[PDB]
Enzyme design. Structure first.
Site, PDB file in Angstrom:
ATOM      1  N   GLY D  10      10.906 -16.081  26.275  1.00 63.02           N
ATOM      2  CA  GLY D  10      11.418 -14.829  26.829  1.00 63.02           C
ATOM      3  C   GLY D  10      12.771 -14.469  26.263  1.00 63.02           C
ATOM      4  O   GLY D  10      13.308 -15.193  25.440  1.00 63.02           O
ATOM      5  N   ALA D  12      15.796 -14.239  27.841  1.00 68.19           N
ATOM      6  CA  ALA D  12      16.840 -15.144  28.319  1.00 68.19           C
ATOM      7  C   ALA D  12      16.848 -16.450  27.532  1.00 68.19           C
ATOM      8  O   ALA D  12      17.892 -16.867  27.031  1.00 68.19           O
ATOM      9  CB  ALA D  12      16.662 -15.422  29.798  1.00 68.19           C
ATOM     10  N   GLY D 146       9.276 -15.282  30.702  1.00 75.11           N
ATOM     11  CA  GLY D 146      10.036 -16.447  31.128  1.00 75.11           C
ATOM     12  C   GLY D 146       9.444 -17.203  32.304  1.00 75.11           C
ATOM     13  O   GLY D 146       9.530 -18.430  32.356  1.00 75.11           O
ATOM     14  N   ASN D 206      22.908 -16.726  37.374  1.00 74.68           N
ATOM     15  CA  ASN D 206      23.657 -15.666  36.685  1.00 74.68           C
ATOM     16  C   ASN D 206      24.804 -15.098  37.513  1.00 74.68           C
ATOM     17  O   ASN D 206      25.762 -14.594  36.948  1.00 74.68           O
ATOM     18  CB  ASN D 206      22.744 -14.509  36.238  1.00 74.68           C
ATOM     19  CG  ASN D 206      22.277 -14.639  34.804  1.00 74.68           C
ATOM     20  OD1 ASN D 206      22.842 -15.381  34.011  1.00 74.68           O
ATOM     21  ND2 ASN D 206      21.238 -13.892  34.458  1.00 74.68           N
ATOM     22  N   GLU D 254      16.330 -41.155  30.149  1.00 79.56           N
ATOM     23  CA  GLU D 254      17.538 -41.574  30.859  1.00 79.56           C
ATOM     24  C   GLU D 254      18.072 -40.500  31.828  1.00 79.56           C
ATOM     25  O   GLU D 254      18.681 -40.845  32.846  1.00 79.56           O
ATOM     26  CB  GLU D 254      18.613 -41.981  29.848  1.00 79.56           C
ATOM     27  CG  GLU D 254      19.713 -42.864  30.422  1.00 79.56           C
ATOM     28  CD  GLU D 254      20.525 -43.596  29.361  1.00 79.56           C
ATOM     29  OE1 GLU D 254      19.954 -44.036  28.334  1.00 79.56           O
ATOM     30  OE2 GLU D 254      21.750 -43.744  29.564  1.00 79.56           O
TER      31      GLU D 254
HETATM   32  N1  LIG Z   1      22.012 -15.572  31.344  1.00 75.48           N
HETATM   33  C1  LIG Z   1      21.184 -14.677  30.762  1.00 75.48           C
HETATM   34  N2  LIG Z   1      20.251 -14.083  31.541  1.00 75.48           N
HETATM   35  C2  LIG Z   1      19.401 -13.182  31.005  1.00 75.48           C
HETATM   36  C3  LIG Z   1      19.481 -12.845  29.582  1.00 75.48           C
HETATM   37  N3  LIG Z   1      18.530 -11.931  29.347  1.00 75.48           N
HETATM   38  C4  LIG Z   1      17.885 -11.710  30.521  1.00 75.48           C
HETATM   39  N4  LIG Z   1      18.423 -12.450  31.496  1.00 75.48           N
HETATM   40  C5  LIG Z   1      17.996 -12.521  32.898  1.00 75.48           C
HETATM   41  O1  LIG Z   1      16.611 -12.851  32.894  1.00 75.48           O
HETATM   42  C6  LIG Z   1      15.935 -12.104  33.899  1.00 75.48           C
HETATM   43  C7  LIG Z   1      14.905 -11.224  33.197  1.00 75.48           C
HETATM   44  O2  LIG Z   1      14.121 -12.050  32.338  1.00 75.48           O
HETATM   45  P1  LIG Z   1      13.955 -11.856  30.744  1.00 75.48           P
HETATM   46  O3  LIG Z   1      14.075 -13.209  30.082  1.00 75.48           O
HETATM   47  O4  LIG Z   1      14.824 -10.733  30.252  1.00 75.48           O
HETATM   48  O5  LIG Z   1      12.426 -11.336  30.656  1.00 75.48           O
HETATM   49  P2  LIG Z   1      11.281 -11.924  29.687  1.00 75.48           P
HETATM   50  O6  LIG Z   1      11.092 -13.401  29.933  1.00 75.48           O
HETATM   51  O7  LIG Z   1      11.583 -11.464  28.286  1.00 75.48           O
HETATM   52  O8  LIG Z   1       9.940 -11.261  30.307  1.00 75.48           O
HETATM   53  P3  LIG Z   1       9.318  -9.768  30.157  1.00 75.48           P
HETATM   54  O9  LIG Z   1      10.269  -8.918  29.357  1.00 75.48           O
HETATM   55  O10 LIG Z   1       9.135  -9.393  31.609  1.00 75.48           O
HETATM   56  O11 LIG Z   1       8.002 -10.017  29.477  1.00 75.48           O
HETATM   57  C8  LIG Z   1      17.021 -11.348  34.657  1.00 75.48           C
HETATM   58  O12 LIG Z   1      17.429 -12.082  35.825  1.00 75.48           O
HETATM   59  C9  LIG Z   1      18.165 -11.239  33.672  1.00 75.48           C
HETATM   60  O13 LIG Z   1      19.447 -11.220  34.301  1.00 75.48           O
HETATM   61  C10 LIG Z   1      20.521 -13.536  28.794  1.00 75.48           C
HETATM   62  O14 LIG Z   1      20.650 -13.293  27.571  1.00 75.48           O
HETATM   63  N5  LIG Z   1      21.312 -14.413  29.442  1.00 75.48           N
END
Ligand SMILES: Nc1nc2c(ncn2[C@@H]2O[C@H](COP(=O)(O)OP(=O)(O)OP(=O)(O)O)[C@@H](O)[C@H]2O)c(=O)[nH]1
Ligand SMILES: Nc1ncnc2c1ncn2[C@@H]1O[C@H](COP(=O)(O)OP(=O)(O)CP(=O)(O)O)[C@@H](O)[C@H]1O
Ligand SMILES: COc1cc(-c2nccc3[nH]c(-c4cccc5[nH]ccc45)nc23)cc(OC)c1OC
Ligand SMILES: Nc1nc2c(ncn2[C@@H]2O[C@H](COP(=O)(O)OP(=O)(O)O)[C@@H](O)[C@H]2O)c(=O)[nH]1
Ligand SMILES: [Ca+2]
Ligand SMILES: [Mg+2]
Ligand SMILES: [Mg+2]
Lengths: 54, 334, 426, 437
Positions: D10, D12, D146, D206, D254
């Protein structure tokens, strides 16, 4: 108070410090779960296309 | 406009705080399960502290200190006083108390009971009051709920005329900064019948509770003697004052008790904030020596004082965090 | 990529204004050549335009009517030459403000020709995400044929997003007495076959023109100025890059908690009359306070009579993104009874640096409020007034319809209303 | 030597992977093109860093990494970005359209068409490993991919690589930077399905990172880039012992032994000090005592919760920089007398310390200032169940009215799976309740 199992090297060093003592599913079942959801999708798309046929 | 919720309807005190807040016109009450609040006048049991302080752009405050139950439950209060280095078993102002379970420090309880049997000097205890140890234990073992066994104060101070037993109740407000505010008005909850030295089982002369006394109103109005009354009696009958003979010791016990637990409960660097109103219950003996009986987490205030106390709660506990458009408290210094 | 469709007089007139407005924002001229000054203008221009011979951009836009009249006006109008000539699909005899003619007789003749142009545009698309329709619900073509097109598009593209900008009728701006009939029959279709419907009420557009904008006798052009500025607003997140990574499907997921309740109240701030430019820019508190005010709503519903299920807000211009968060959170916490407590974090706010033509600060509001039931109750009342005496029904029974179909439409719209009421007290 | 494969699912996961591999490259002295001039055994070796990087005959050091997203946009920025040469195309897997904030679309619908491709590309890295010990999986709880695709991957990795360990770096959802209203649903669904498949999981709220960036870095409105560079410091500290010469947390097994006695309760709280602004004018350097003490302030934790009300099962201190054992033991002795640190009766009240003398590296032009010494505490405390209670309540509010459920059912998922997942979380909150009273 008691420091034990101390190890050292050039990069760093590690140890423990104790203050006080004490007192899966198969490949078959996964494929079955995914496909049962695919059949429920196909059934729902059929019900839509049947409704549109009417 | 600040926002608040109310989750304890039985609260005599915070019913009057919620009423007073609405009347200022800068607070509105929300629904019970609305998470978007500034203030929380929360429940007594299972208060969800883990949900507080996680709302963006909302400073959250609650009227209970998480972990304060250690001081406000009998079994825990005894365990706090024995184990803590700040207080210790040396602690002169707490009765010699022991924790006993139904079928534990029974081995340590019997050791001091048989040391009372060396000289055979007065040996009364309280859980419901009895002299024989095996008579007390059999009451506890077939009840189910755990309550401690405590050294009973055989020689309490006695008001005259009447020969009456009593306990003092003091109200303490701890704010978000951990200032400890003692309310200037306390109250003596009195017995209305003479204290019996020989027989222990007589109910109303030994126990001096708000409700169990319902003789009800003989010497004063509703078994409540206030601080101006009680000061004058001490001045006339004993030559001393409430301040010197009793109130310093109260101030020492309150301060010592809340200093002990400050590291465990303080909300100084936290994401949500706590205040709490406590009820400290004291017992004065014939030599003018104050003893701590119990601390009360949800304290029931006396009828005369509601208007004054609940305004003071608003002044320094709520409005200090949430400001608007002489003091009734004595601050205990640490 | 989105495929745009515009059906009937109203659909084609607001639709032509939309392409007029967003082409100016992307720097595309009346010949289709890019003459802008920012790479940010071209970064998501695939979403609404196809790239052609000589690096010219052509709207992915299909123009539909049973009358030749209005589409000749589009072609001869200011931006008319940018549209692909094969995408003008038109009959000759009109629908005479008759849903039945649009849906069952006159529109049936023409529908397959439109679907051939849709299919042509769909095959060019790298990754077709969905469709958007502009139309009224009170006439015959946009209402009757538009909802037929929607139903046939869902047959051929069942997993794609259907999006409508559906203009609602009002006695204050009324072409014919049969509008409540045409509207109710259309609402029934939108409830079943669309994922998102922007309810653009002509009552609201009139009242904003009369009361707030001080235009004593507003034309359709004045009404359409409000529609185009709103349409640009809601499509900002699709048309420009942001931190949100915005998507038609994700909007539907986050805005629509129950599949039938997908009828949104659009709103816009600041409200502006045509041509004359206001000089004082608004503060962020003023934008926030205006977009949530009932006077700025494009659907004639008082949001204080209902509750917000979900909210989407889109701020345009150079401003403090902290100040926006603060003010948006302020509106929620100061009026928390009008948002449902059982959907946490139900208001989301996006920001775009590029502002629209005329304004330096602006805000577009998209609300799925339960107070939209007032809109449907109003059309339901006007429907029943005539239908209880079977009045004007011969225009429809003469085209093959039965009274049962009217009773079923009445019944599903009253269900929609009581279902909105269900969550207003929950 | 034992290899570790990092999987990024994903947006994130991918964007946090970027931040991490960028940092790993700076720490080991690997360049954008993948050349490491300090390495002398060209085209091979079994050093500590070779746990995270394989080698080519040309001298390139390539991450043992697979980035997988159901939408191209995010992974395309990796393909065209400053570390484009570092990875080879087969590591960077992209689908056509995303899961649209829907667990069920990610797990069932779009998951099914891509799972075999990914496991195949994972097998192509596992066949370069002489002794694979397992996987580090980076993802969000909130996203559709994700949450959804990750849980499907974790199911199949237990089937294909049953003897190998699986660690999680999970981003817990916060309204302050949310992309979707249904993130509570996705969080509960994925935690349920992933629970028995994950050996240890480091949750990062976050909310916690956002406020650290506001409070300690003076950034009014933190971007993902701000949050991620801070997250990668915490990740680097946790992974440092796999990549460097040491004797604490040397293999993935570990981490289970040290931090995870109860296998379901495998969510250790990370706390990190100190976080200091790069353009702070005058900065006073903080000592061993001060930064160790900062590990017990909630404001420095990856999840905001209260360790005082709860019990500890294990506690690791991972220091980086100018730190000696003598100072650490004196810092611990002071803190023990002043703070409420309570262990479970069946565990020893003690700390496993790990010092690495190389001080923490920072990204040039970043928001984090250079520090002489820093620390990351890893404590398995029951206080983290607060994060579960919060998230479950938000689930209950929505699920009570069946809000948004139709989106999930419409992708083939059964309504039963919601309450089935919620019962597991209710059992998980009970598991924590029993341990810490
Ligand atoms: N810390 C952090 N959180 C992130 C980032 N990008 C997205 N998020 C968080 O991740 C959540 C959304 O999930 P994403 O990972 O963007 O979605 P994805 O897994 O790409 O899934 P879809 O787009 O729904 O297919 C939210 O709570 C965002 O705040 C990042 O670069 N850093
Ligand atoms: N060790 C002791 N010596 C003398 N009296 C005692 C005592 N322990 C309890 N009592 C008496 O018993 C009465 C009630 O006991 P206690 O205060 O423990 O329960 P309570 O908790 O139900 C009253 P409250 O909650 O209002 O303080 C008091 O009024 C006090 O006089
Ligand atoms: C299609 O364009 C948009 C997408 C979005 C959008 N895109 C991706 C995910 C989204 N989630 C939400 C959303 C909408 C409403 C409440 C919400 N709570 C948390 C997220 C959220 N809107 C989203 C938002 C918009 O308004 C600001 C858009 O303009 C209309
Ligand atoms: N806002 C707006 N409404 C219009 C416009 N033209 C027609 N309408 C409304 O749409 C309804 C008539 O539909 P129309 O589109 O003319 O019929 P069609 O061409 O047969 O679909 C009436 O309720 C009108 O008020 C327009 O340009 N703008
Ligand atoms: Ca080598
Ligand atoms: Mg007309
Ligand atoms: Mg995504």
């Amino acid at each position: 108070m008691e420091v034990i199992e101390l190890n050292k090297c050039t990069s760093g060093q590690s140890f423990e410090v104790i203050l006080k003592p004490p007192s899966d599913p198969s490949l078959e079942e996964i494929q079955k779960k995914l496909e049962a959801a695919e059949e429920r999708r196909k059934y729902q798309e059929a019900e839509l296309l049947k409704h549109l046929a009417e | 406009m600040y926002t608040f919720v109310v989750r304890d309807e039985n609260s005599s005190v915070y019913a009057e705080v919620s009423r007073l807040l609405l009347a200022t016109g800068q607070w509105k009450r929300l629904r019970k399960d609305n998470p978007r609040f500034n203030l929380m006048l929360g429940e007594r049991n299972r208060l969800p502290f883990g949900r507080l302080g996680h709302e963006p752009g909302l400073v959250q405050l609650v009227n209970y200190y998480r972990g304060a139950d250690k001081l406000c439950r009998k079994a825990s209060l005894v365990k706090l006083i024995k184990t803590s280095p700040e207080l210790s078993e040396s602690c002169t102002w707490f009765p010699e108390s022991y924790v006993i379970y139904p079928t534990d420090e029974r081995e340590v309880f019997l050791a001091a009971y048989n040391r009372r049997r060396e000289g055979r000097e007065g040996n009364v205890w309280i859980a419901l009051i009895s002299s024989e140890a095996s008579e007390l234990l059999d009451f506890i073992d077939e009840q189910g709920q755990v309550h401690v066994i405590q050294k009973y104060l055989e020689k309490p101070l006695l008001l005259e005329p009447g020969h009456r037993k009593f306990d003092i109740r003091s109200w303490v407000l701890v704010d978000h900064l951990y200032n400890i505010y003692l309310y200037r008005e306390g109250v003596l909850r009195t017995s209305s019948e003479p204290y019996n030295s020989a027989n222990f089982q007589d109910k109303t002369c030994h126990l001096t509770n708000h409700c169990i006394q319902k003789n009800y109103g003989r010497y004063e109005e509703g078994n409540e003697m206030f601080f101006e009354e009680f000061n004058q009696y001490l001045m006339d009958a004993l030559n001393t004052t409430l301040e010197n003979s009793i109130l310093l010791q109260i101030k020492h016990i309150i301060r010592s008790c809340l200093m002990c637990i400050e590291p465990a409960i303080s909300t100084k660097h936290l994401h949500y904030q706590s205040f709490q109103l406590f009820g400290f219950d004291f017992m004065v003996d014939e030599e003018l020596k104050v003893w701590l009986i119990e601390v009360n987490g949800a304290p029931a205030c006396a009828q005369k004082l509601y208007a004054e106390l609940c305004q003071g709660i608003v002044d320094v506990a709520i409005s200090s965090v949430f400001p608007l458009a002489t003091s009734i408290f004595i601050k205990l210094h640490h | 990529e989105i495929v745009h469709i515009q059906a009937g007089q109203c659909g084609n007139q607001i639709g032509a204004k939309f392409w007029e407005v967003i082409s100016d924002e992307h720097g595309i001229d009346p010949t289709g050549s890019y003459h802008g000054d920012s790479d940010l203008q071209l970064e998501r221009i695939n979403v609404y335009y196809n790239e052609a011979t000589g690096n010219k951009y052509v709207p992915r836009a299909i123009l539909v009517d049973l009358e030749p009249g209005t589409m000749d006006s589009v072609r001869s109008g200011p931006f008319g030459q940018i549209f692909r000539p094969d995408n003008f699909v038109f009959g000759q005899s009109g629908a005479g403000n008759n849903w039945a003619k649009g849906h069952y007789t006159e529109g049936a003749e023409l529908v397959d020709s439109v679907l051939d142009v849709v299919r042509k545009e769909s095959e060019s698309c790298d990754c077709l995400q969905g469709f958007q329709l502009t139309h009224s619900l009170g006439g015959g073509t946009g209402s009757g044929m538009g909802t037929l097109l929607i139903s046939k598009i869902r047959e051929e593209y069942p997993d794609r997003i259907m999006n409508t900008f559906s203009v609602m009728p009002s006695p204050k701006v009324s072409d014919t007495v049969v509008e409540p009939y045409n509207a109710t029959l259309s609402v029934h279709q939108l409830v079943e076959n669309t994922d998102e419907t922007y309810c653009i009420d002509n009552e609201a557009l009139y009242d904003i023109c009369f009361r707030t904008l001080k235009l004593t006798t507003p034309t359709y052009g004045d009404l359409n100025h409000l529609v185009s500025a709103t349409m640009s607003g809601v499509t900002t997140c699709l048309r420009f890059p942001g931190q949100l990574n915005a998507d038609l499907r994700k909007l539907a997921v986050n805005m629509v908690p129950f599949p039938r309740l997908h009828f949104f109240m659009p709103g816009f701030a600041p409200l502006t009359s045509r041509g004359s430019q206001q000089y004082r820019a608004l503060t962020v508190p003023e934008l926030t306070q205006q977009m949530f005010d009932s006077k700025n709503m494009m659907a004639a519903c008082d949001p204080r009579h209902g509750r917000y299920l979900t909210v989407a807000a889109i701020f345009r211009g150079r401003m403090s993104m902290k100040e926006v968060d603060e003010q948006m959170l302020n509106v929620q916490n100061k009026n928390s009874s009008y948002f449902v407590e059982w959907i946490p974090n139900n208001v989301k706010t996006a920001v775009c640096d590029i502002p629209p033509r005329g304004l330096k600060m602006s805000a577009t509001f998209i609300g799925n409020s339960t107070a939209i039931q007032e809109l449907f109750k109003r059309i339901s009342e006007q429907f029943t007034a005539m239908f209880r005496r079977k009045a004007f029904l011969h225009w429809y029974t003469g085209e093959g319809m039965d009274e049962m179909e009217f009773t079923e439409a009445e019944s599903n719209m009253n269900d929609l209303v009581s279902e909105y009421q269900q969550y207003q007290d929950a | 030597m034992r290899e570790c494969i990092s999987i990024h699912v994903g947006q994130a996961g991918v964007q946090i992977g970027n931040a991490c591999w960028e940092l790993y490259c700076l720490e080991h002295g690997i360049q954008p093109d993948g050349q490491m001039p300090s390495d002398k055994t060209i085209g091979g070796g079994d050093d500590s860093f070779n746990t995270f990087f394989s080698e080519t005959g040309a001298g390139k050091h390539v991450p043992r990494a697979v980035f997988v997203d159901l939408e191209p946009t995010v992974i395309d920025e990796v393909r065209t970005g400053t570390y484009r040469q570092l990875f080879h195309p087969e590591q960077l897997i992209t689908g056509k359209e995303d899961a649209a904030n829907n667990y069920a679309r990610g797990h069932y619908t779009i998951g099914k068409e891509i799972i075999d491709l990914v496991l195949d590309r994972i097998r192509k890295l596992a066949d370069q490993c002489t002794g694979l010990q397992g996987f580090l999986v980076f993802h969000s709880f909130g996203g559709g991919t994700g949450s959804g695709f990750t849980s499907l991957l974790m199911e199949r990795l237990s089937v294909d690589y049953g003897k190998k360990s699986k660690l999680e770096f999970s981003i817990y959802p916060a309204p302050q930077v949310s992309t979707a209203v249904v993130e509570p649903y996705n969080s509960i669904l994925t935690t349920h399905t992933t629970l028995e498949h994950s050996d240890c999981a480091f949750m990062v709220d976050n909310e916690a990172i956002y406020d650290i960036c506001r409070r300690n870095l003076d950034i009014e409105r933190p971007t993902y880039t701000n949050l991620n560079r801070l997250i990668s410091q915490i990740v680097s500290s946790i992974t440092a012992s796999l990549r460097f010469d040491g004797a604490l947390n040397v293999d993935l097994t570990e981490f289970q032994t040290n931090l995870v006695p109860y296998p379901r309760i495998h969510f250790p709280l990370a706390t990190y000090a100190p976080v200091i602004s790069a353009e702070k004018a005058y900065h006073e350097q903080l000592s061993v005592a001060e930064i160790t003490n900062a590990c017990f302030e909630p404001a420095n934790q990856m999840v905001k919760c209260d360790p005082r009300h709860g019990k500890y099962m294990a506690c690791c201190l991972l220091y980086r920089g100018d730190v000696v054992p003598k100072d650490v033991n004196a810092a611990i002795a002071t803190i023990k007398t002043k703070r409420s640190i309570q262990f479970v009766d069946w565990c020893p009240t003690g700390f496993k310390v790990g010092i690495n003398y190389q001080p923490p590296t920072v990204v040039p032009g970043g928001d984090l200032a250079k520090v002489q010494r820093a620390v990351c505490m890893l404590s398995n405390t029951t206080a983290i169940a607060e994060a579960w209670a919060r998230l479950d309540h938000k689930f209950d509010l929505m699920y009570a009215k069946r809000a948004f459920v139709h989106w999930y059912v419409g992708e083939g998922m059964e309504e039963g799976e919601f309450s089935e997942a919620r019962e597991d979380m209710a059992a998980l909150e009970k598991d924590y309740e029993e341990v810490g009273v």
